[PDB]
Each structure stands twice: as C-alpha cells, then as structure tokens.
Amino acid sequence: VHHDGFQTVKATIDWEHPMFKLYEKAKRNGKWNPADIDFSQDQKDFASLTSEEKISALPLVAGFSAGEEAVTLDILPMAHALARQGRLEDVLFLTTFMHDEAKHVEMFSRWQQAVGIGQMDLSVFHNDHYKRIFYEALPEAMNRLYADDSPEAVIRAATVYNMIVEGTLAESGYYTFRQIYKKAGLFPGLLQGIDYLNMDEGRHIQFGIYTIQRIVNEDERYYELFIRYMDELWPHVIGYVDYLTELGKRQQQLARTYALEIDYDLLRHYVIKQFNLRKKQISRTK
C-alpha cells in the first residue's frame, strides 16, 4: 500500500526519541564480529573431554542455537507493524536488533562447526515445553501482528519475545554458562561470544520495556494483560528448566572432573528471579 509522504522529507528524524537514542547506542556498542573470535582452544577442550562430559554442554547450546534462529525470523513482523504505524525511530532501532540476532545465530553455529558437532542434530534436546515456546507460541504471537496490530497484540508479542524468551530464558542461560564453563576455564571463545550476546540483549530487553510501557501508559488495564501473558508461559519456562536440570543431574562426569559444584537450585532460583524482575520493570501506573 502507498506511502502518503516521508518523515525525513517533511521534517527530520525525532532526535530525542528513546528508540533513536537506543539505535545510537547499538551502533556504538555493536561492532563485534563472531568471525573474529578464536575458537581454536574450544576445539581442543571439547576433544579432550570424554563422550559423557562432551554431552553435558550440548543441551544449552541446542537451546540457544534454535532460540537465536527463531528470533531472527520472528522479529520481522514487529518491524513491519511498527513501520506501518509510522514509528520510524523504532524501525531504525529494530534494524540493529535484527542484525544483532543474525550475529548470534552465526556465533553458536561457528562454535558447533569448530568443535566438530556441526553434523550432529541437536533437536533431540528440545523437549515438549521448549517446542511450545519456540516452535509455536513465539511465531504465533509475532505473525499475528501482520493482520492485527492492536495494543493487545503488540503487548502479547513484546511479552513473549522480549520479556520471556530474552528477559527470562536468554538471561538465565548467560548466567548458567558462566556458572559452569567460566568456572571450569573451558570454552573461552564461546564465553567471549556469550559476553557480547549478553551486552546486545540489554538493548533488546529495553525495547520490549519501552513498547509495553508506552501501551500500558495509555490504559492501565493493559497491565493486567501483560501479567496474564507472562503467567501463561511460566509453566513452559519452568518445564524446560526442570528438563535441563534433570539432564544435568544425570550426567555428573564434567562437574566431577573440573571440581565444579553445580548448584541447580541456585540456577532455578535465578530463573524465578529473572521472571519476577521482568514483571516489575513494567509500572501499572504512569
């Protein structure tokens, strides 16, 4: 459908818009390139491990690789919906969001290739709860925006993408990687990637907070919808976490070899904490 006119011909970019500022920060802080990371030491670590210890890191990598690919594809409808609404500054920012996720897909795929498991199909570590979030709910909620860009639909998309997938699962995954592999002194290239990912993620979550809060600001009754959509996905979040935990408790060999005291209770409480903390970053009033 036709353009009526163009903001940057009639006027200029809104230089003070919060998403324009976030866009500027993303260009400044987003120079990293997965292709520059040295994975040579990761190859050697992984080869040195036994079959049993080798398996241990794969479930978390399986979760991340599919998750990065899902969001790369599933962010496009949000960019379209906001473009149609004429929110140019949000679109500018979303180009950095999409390009970030592309590099995240690239980072985990380079690690898989480097350590010699590219040919292995890691879908075996996606349980039913994971599939519900990443194979189904995420794409349903985002694709909806093509035909329905009501405040209800936008809130649900932002909640599932930014507050659950990124703000709850991804954040807890970064924490888990550091608690286990950083302590062991294993997989330095991967952990360097994880640090860059964690920094990009801060902006992604802030876009979701901005989006949800500007809709709640119009009608405080959307606050209840946000809470409800958070709670709907909790059982799948914790059902995936419990599955990973249970795989971890059965495959102890890595924790024994590296003298790691993997506290699964601490990791569980971190996920619960992340979830409640995201809930609290949205104000009912304002």
Place this chain on the structure above:
Amino acid sequence: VHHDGFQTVKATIDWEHPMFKLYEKAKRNGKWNPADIDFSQDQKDFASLTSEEKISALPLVAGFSAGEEAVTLDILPMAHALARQGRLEDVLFLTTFMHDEAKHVEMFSRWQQAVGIGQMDLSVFHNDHYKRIFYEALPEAMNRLYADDSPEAVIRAATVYNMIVEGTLAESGYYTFRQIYKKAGLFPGLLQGIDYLNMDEGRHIQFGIYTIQRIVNEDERYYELFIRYMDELWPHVIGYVDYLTELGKRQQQLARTYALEIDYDLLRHYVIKQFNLRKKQISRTK
C-alpha cells in the same frame, strides 16, 4: 505459523553460500557511522550561498531522503518471504541491507538538520513520475510478497528495488553529486556520506543480481519478465530525470558562481547507461 525445525540445530549455516559471503563482507565493510561525520563545514557553505543557489541542491536531497526511507520500510517483505522459504543465509545478509538503509536515512536527515533546512518540507520536489516509483510501484511490488512469493513476484520485487531504484536511480545520483558538488568543493560532509552510501550500494545491487539470476537459472523464460519489468518503469525514471534536469537548467546561479560546467546531457546519458548495464548483468542462459 510453526517452525518445523532449525537449520543451525540440525546442521550449520551454509558457509559457502554466496549470500553468506556477502553478509561477511557487509560486516567487514559496514562499520561507518553517520553520527561521526563532521557537517560543520557544510553548514557554513550552505549559509554562504544565496537563496537561488541554496535551492539548487535541494531537489537531489529531496529525492534521496524519501528514497532511503521508502527502501528501509519496503525491504521488510523480501526478508519475510525469503525467511518463509527457509533461505537463512539470505536473511542474514538482509539484516545488513536493512541496517545500511537505516544509516542512509540517518545520514541525509543529519545533513538537512545541520544546514538548517530540517523544518522545510522538501516534498515539493517530488513530481508525478517520482511518486509513481517511490510512493506507489515500489511498495506495491514489495508488499505483494506477503501473499504471493512466486518466482514472478520475487523477480518483479528485485527488479524494481535493486535494479531500478538502487542500480539505476541511486547510482546516477551518486554520480551527479560528485560531478556537481565535489568539483565545486562544497558540502564535504555530505560527499563523505555519499562515498559510504555508494560502497554499501554495491552489496545491495549484488543481492538483486543473485536473486534475479537464481530464478532465471530455473527457467530462462523469466528473463523476458525481467526485461519487461525494467522497461515498464523506464518512462518514470527518465520522466523524473528530465524534471530534475529542467529545474537545474532554470537555476544556473550555482554553476556560474563556482565555474562549474554542469553537462546535463552527460548526466542523462549516464542514467541511460546505468539502465542498460543493469539489464546486461542478468544472463538469459545459465
């Protein structure tokens, strides 16, 4: 609609894919930031000009600013269509394409703001032929891909976007800027931007060539469609060029002051040459 699985969990990125290589080149060669460009000398040049000379550069800037905004919005459906087809490497590359165009929108808008014409509505320099391409045909052809991703639709979208808008109009515009303002020693910040834009554009055009050629490779009869879609838009291309030329010939004061011999015939032949050259980068056979 649900994901069936994920390429980077089952396998890896296709490291040898042409669009993966182009994506790698884009990350290496796309570090520039419009926010770093010094426009202080451009402000002074523009202030030093008289009202008559001031007007002279505005029509070309008006064309570019709207053009950059249109493609930023209108590339999204191509990314979606290729994602739905499972072309992950093309999607990775398109994140760099979209982010490039965002910086291009930003560059011209910063120049407008800097030289003191942000508040001026430059839509007055968009004639009917321009509107036909940028307000109508471009968004029609791209939005079609949401509901129709047939080889016919993809070829038409790539032809209008990459071969006409970028490969014919944008390229001739970069050439025009250099022939006029670079010779005058005017607007150094802007010309620095134009150099970065011209470098990004090389990748954008290569994506269009790749896309059109891989469809023609399947059925040489799509070649005729490509030619036909090129020819359909020619009258609007040359109708806009003739309008700009005619504005240029009426406002001679800048060319006189800076001792510039603006050869409008040369600029016209460059557009004609660009158009035929794009036609020839697609092989009917292969």
